[PDB]
Design a binder for these strands. Structure first.
Length: 85
DNA sequence: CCTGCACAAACACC
DNA sequence: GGTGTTTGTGCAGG
């Protein structure tokens, strides 16, 4: 059995996992797809100083993830792309 | 140096 | 279970 490692989540999911639950408790009738749209709208309204703390914590998650797999590399699946010249 | 694609998680509805 | 939705981060190509 092989255990695959998942990439660290950025400052938006960290913020959205906590903010998503609150929006579901206060808006139990709102669907996640509509909440996602409202969260993106509210997140773009946050100031750099307000987002800084969320940037610092996500970076800690990235370092803690790095401490678990310091030699990890992000390797995305690119689409068969061959451009003629 | 600049631009574009891939990939992460959570919940309601059928 | 699969679908539909969001932003941030990293790597590849020209």
């Amino acid at each position: 059995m092989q255990d695959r490692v998942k990439r660290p989540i950025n400052a938006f999911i960290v913020w959205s996992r906590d903010q998503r639950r609150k929006m579901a408790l206060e808006n139990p009738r709102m669907r996640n797809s509509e909440i996602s749209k409202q969260l993106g709208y509210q997140w773009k309204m946050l100031t750099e100083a307000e987002k800084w703390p969320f940037f610092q914590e996500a970076q800690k998650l990235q370092a803690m993830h790095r401490e678990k797999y310091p030699n990890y590399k992000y390797r995305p699946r690119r689409k068969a792309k061959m451009l003629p010249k």
